[PDB]
Amino acid sequence: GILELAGTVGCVGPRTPIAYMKYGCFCGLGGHGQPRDAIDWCCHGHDCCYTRAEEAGCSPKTERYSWQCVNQSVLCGPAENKCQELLCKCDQEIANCLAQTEYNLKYLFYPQFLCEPDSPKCD
Ligand SMILES: NC(=O)c1cc2ccccc2n1-c1cccc(C(F)(F)F)c1
Ligand SMILES: [Ca+2]
Ligand SMILES: [Cl-]
Ligand SMILES: [Cl-]
Numbered sequence: 001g002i003l004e005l006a007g008t009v010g011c012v013g014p015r016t017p018i019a020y021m022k023y024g025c026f027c028g029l030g031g032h033g034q035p036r037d038a039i040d041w042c043c044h045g046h047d048c049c050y051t052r053a054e055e056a057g058c059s060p061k062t063e064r065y066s067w068q069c070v071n072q073s074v075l076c077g078p079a080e081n082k083c084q085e086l087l088c089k090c091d092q093e094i095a096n097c098l099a100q101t102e103y104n105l106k107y108l109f110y111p112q113f114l115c116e117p118d119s120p121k122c123d
Contacts, residue, residue, distance in 0.1 A: 001062045001087070008091040011069035013099035020098065024107045025115035033115030036107050042097035048122030049090035058083035060090065067092075072099075 006017040024040030025033035026047055035041045050060040065084035068075040074095050076088035 001060070001064055004065055004067060004088070005091050005094075007069075008067065008074045008088075008095040009098060011074055012072055012095040015103060019103065019108070022109050024110055025112075025119075031115075032117060032119050035120065036110065037104050038101045039098060039103065040107065042094050042101065044120060045097065045123075046090060046094040049093065051122060053083070053086050053090060056083070056086060058086060060087050063087055 009017045009020065020027040020039070020043065022028040024036040024043065025031050026035055026040050026043035028043075031043065031047055035044045053060040063083055065076070065088050066078055067088055068077075074088070074092040076085065076092055079085040079088070
């Protein structure tokens with residue numbers, strides 16, 4: 001869930017998870033448009049991952065799952081079911097993605113009216 005999303009992102013990366021609560025066109029609840037930067041691409045990818053999780057019958061915003069932070073890396077488990085494993089994989093992925101990015105302050109609280117109606121496709 002959101003608790004583990006924040007936790008995993010904090011574990012791996014250099015910055016507060018507050019940094020991604022409203023950033024670019026995709027970091028934040030929902031999102032649409034051309035991603036502005038690497039960070040925004042990570043968030044688009046995560047949005048897709050969560051969409052897939054929901055299509056599989058999971059609740060990616062709420063379900064609790066166990067994980068470990070070891071040397072600023074996320075280890076997923078123990079998993080009681082497939083939803084817990086899918087969710088941790090999604091969050092592990094974005095955490096790794098964001099940890100490799102430079103922050104562009106100008107995209108924090110970016111205006112939604114500059115974000116295009118359509119978005120790039122999900123893998
Ligand atoms: N892919 C995202 O949008 C996203 C990425 C991210 C990273 C750290 C902390 C939060 C983060 N979010 C986010 C922010 C607000 C609401 C939601 C929710 F999952 F509820 F949609 C998700
Ligand atoms: Ca989003
Ligand atoms: Cl910070
Ligand atoms: Cl939603």
